[PDB]
Design goal:
two-stranded antiparallel sheet; binds sodium ion; monooxygenase activity; binds protoporphyrin IX containing FE; binds the ligand NC1=N[C@@]2(c3ccc(F)cc3F)CO[C@@H](c3cn[nH]c3)C[C@H]2CS1; binds zinc ion; monooxygenase; membrane; oxidoreductase activity
C-alpha cells in the first residue's frame, strides 16, 4: 500500500529536473501535475519491473486531450498514442508485418538505403571543404528511406514540397514539448476557447495538411491490381476489405495518422542520432580513425556497406550503440499509464497512474556503465574486442510498446554511418570553439548546433 515518495504541490528542461528529484528521493518517486498522478521510474530495475514484469498492466497510454483537434477517435488513434487495446494491436501488427514484407531484413531495402546514402555522400561532397551544419542533409536522406517504405517514393533534396514537409515536422516536434501543451492536457476545458485551439498545434496541423496532399496524389497512382508496393498501398487495400466494418482501425482518419507518425518518426529519430554520431566523431578523432580502419579491413573504400558486414565489425557496432547511449535522444521515453494496480520496487502504483520511464537514467546508470557520462565505445566491448550489449541498453524502451521502428533504425544507423565514414573524414572547423557535447531538449534531444568539415578520402 506504500505509495512512492515525492514533493507535495521547467518543461523545456524536464530530464534535468527529474535527475535532481531522482537522487533526492530514490528510483521510484511520485510527483503531482495538476490533477494527474505521475510516477517516475529510474534505473534499469524499476523500468524493467514496470514495462516487462508488469507489462500487461503498463502497456497503456495516458489520454492526450489536445489530440482531439487532429481528428482522433476510437478506431483512429494510430499506434503511438493509441490506447492499449484492439485498435493499437491491429495497427502495430500491421506496421511490423508490412515493413517486413517490403524488404526490412532483406537485401532489398538494404540496397535501397545504401543507394540513398550515395545521394547523401554526394551532397556532403558538394560542400567542398567548407564548414556546414550536416543536420538538414541527414534529415533528407533518412526521410527518403521511410518515405520509400510508406509513400513508395523518394524526394530530391531541393524539392520545395519535401523541404516544407521536413520543416513542418521539425516545428511540430517542438510543439510536442513546452509548457503550453501541458496545461491544455492537464485541464482540457481550456481547449474550448476557439482562439486558443488554433495556436497550440499550429505546425502539426500544417504538417498533416501537407501530408494529405501527398496522400491524395499517391491514391491516384496506386494500382490495386498489383501487390502493395509500400505501406500506404497496403493500408488502402485493407481499407477496401474493411468497407462496412465499424470495428476496423483501417479508415481514412487512421491512414493519415499512421503515415504521419511513421514518416516523422522515421525522420527525426535516426537523423538526430546520426547528428550525434558525426558530432562525437569530430570530438573524438581517434575513435573515427579506428572505425575507418575497421571499415577498410572488412568492406574497403570501394563497395557499399551491407548488413552482413556488421557481424564482422564489432568496433563500429560498439560506436553506433555508444552514440545511441550517449546521444540519449529520448530521455524520458513516451508516457505510459497503468491499466491495473501494480508493485514496483516495493512501492504501490494504483491503476490509472501516468508512468514516466526515465530511459536516460538507464542509459547512463552509474551502477551498470563504466563511464556513463563519457563517450566510451568500450561500453560495448570486452578486452578481446568482441561486441557485447548490456541489458541496460534500452534506447527503444521495453515491453509491448517498445519501438517498432528499431529494426529499421538499426540498419539505417549502420548503413548511413559506415558509408559516411567510408568516404569522408570529419573534423571541427579550424578556428572554431570546441563544440559542446551537451544537447538541447525538445522531447527529443538534439546536439547543440555545430559545424564540421567533410573532406573526402
Ligand atoms: C534511433 C531511432 C529511434 C529511437 C531511439 C526510438 C525510440 C523509441 C521510444 C523510446 C519509444 C517509446 C516506447 C514506449 O512507449 O515505451 C518508441 C516508440 C515508437 N517508435 Fe521509435 N525510436 C526510433 C526510431 C523509430 C523509427 C525509425 C520508427 C518508424 C519508422 C519509429 C516508430 C515508433 C512507433 C510507432 C512507436 C510506438 C510503438 C507503440 O506505441 O506500440 N521509431 N520509439
Ligand atoms: N508522438 C510522436 N512524436 C514524434 C513527432 C511528433 C510530432 C511531430 F510534429 C513530429 C514528430 F516527429 C516524435 O517522436 C517520434 C519517435 C519515434 N520513436 N521514438 C520517438 C515519433 C513522432 C511521431 S508521433
Ligand atoms: Na531493444
Ligand atoms: Zn505507392
Ligand atoms: Zn567526449
Ligand atoms: Zn569476448
Ligand atoms: Zn569516396
Amino acid at each position: 500500500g506504500k505509495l512512492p515518495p515525492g514533493p507535495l504541490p521547467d518543461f523545456q528542461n524536464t530530464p534535468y529536473c527529474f535527475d535532481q528529484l531522482r537522487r533526492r528521493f530514490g528510483d521510484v518517486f511520485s510527483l503531482q501535475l495538476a490533477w494527474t498522478p505521475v510516477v517516475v521510474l529510474n534505473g534499469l530495475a524499476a523500468v524493467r519491473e514496470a514495462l516487462v514484469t508488469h507489462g500487461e498492466d503498463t502497456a497503456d497510454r495516458p489520454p492526450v486531450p489536445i489530440t482531439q483537434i487532429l481528428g482522433f477517435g476510437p478506431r483512429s488513434q494510430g499506434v503511438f498514442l493509441a490506447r492499449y487495446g484492439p485498435a493499437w494491436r491491429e495497427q502495430r501488427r500491421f506496421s511490423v508485418s508490412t515493413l517486413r514484407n517490403l524488404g526490412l531484413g532483406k537485401k532489398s531495402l538494404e540496397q535501397w538505403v545504401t543507394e540513398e546514402a550515395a545521394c547523401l555522400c554526394a551532397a556532403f561532397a558538394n560542400h567542398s571543404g567548407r564548414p556546414f551544419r550536416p543536420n538538414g542533409l541527414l534529415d533528407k536522406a533518412v526521410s527518403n528511406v521511410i518515405a520509400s517504405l510508406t509513400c513508395g517514393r523518394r524526394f530530391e533534396y531541393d524539392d520545395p514540397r519535401f523541404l516544407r514537409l521536413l520543416d513542418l515536422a521539425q516545428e511540430g516536434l517542438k510543439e510536442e514539448s513546452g509548457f503550453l501543451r501541458e496545461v491544455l492536457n492537464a485541464v482540457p476545458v481550456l481547449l474550448h476557447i476557439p482562439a486558443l485551439a488554433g495556436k497550440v498545434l499550429r505546425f502539426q496541423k500544417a504538417f498533416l495538411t501537407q501530408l494529405d496532399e501527398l496522400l491524395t496524389e499517391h491514391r491516384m497512382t496506386w494500382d490495386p491490381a498489383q501487390p502493395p508496393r509500400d505501406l500506404t498501398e497496403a493500408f488502402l487495400a485493407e481499407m477496401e476489405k474493411a468497407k462496412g466494418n465499424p470495428e476496423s482501425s483501417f479508415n481514412d482518419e487512421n491512414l493519415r495518422i499512421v503515415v504521419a507518425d511513421l514518416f516523422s518518426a522515421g525522420m527525426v529519430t535516426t537523423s538526430t542520432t546520426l547528428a550525434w554520431g558525426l558530432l562525437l566523431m569530430i570530438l573524438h578523432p581517434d575513435v573515427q580513425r579506428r572505425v575507418q580502419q575497421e571499415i577498410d579491413d572488412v568492406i574497403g573504400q570501394v563497395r557499399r556497406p551491407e548488413m552482413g558486414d556488421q557481424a564482422h565489425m564489432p568496433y563500429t557496432t560498439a560506436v553506433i550503440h555508444e552514440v545511441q547511449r550517449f546521444g540519449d535522444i529520448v530521455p524520458l521515453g513516451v508516457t505510459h499509464m497503468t491499466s491495473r494496480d501494480i508493485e514496483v520496487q516495493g512501492f504501490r502504483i494504483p491503476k490509472g497512474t501516468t508512468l514516466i520511464t526515465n530511459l536516460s537514467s538507464v542509459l547512463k546508470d552509474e551502477a551498470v556503465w563504466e563511464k556513463p557520462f563519457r563517450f566510451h565505445p568500450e561500453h560495448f566491448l570486452d578486452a578481446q574486442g568482441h561486441f557485447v550489449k548490456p541489458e541496460a541498453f534500452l534506447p527503444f524502451s521495453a515491453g509491448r510498446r517498445a519501438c517498432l521502428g528499431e529494426p529499421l533504425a538499426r540498419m539505417e544507423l549502420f548503413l548511413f554511418f559506415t558509408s559516411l565514414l567510408q568516404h569522408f573524414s570529419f573534423s571541427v572547423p579550424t578556428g572554431q570553439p570546441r563544440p559542446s557535447h551537451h544537447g538541447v531538449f525538445a522531447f527529443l534531444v538534439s546536439p547543440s548546433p555545430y559545424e564540421l568539415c567533410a573532406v573526402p578520402r
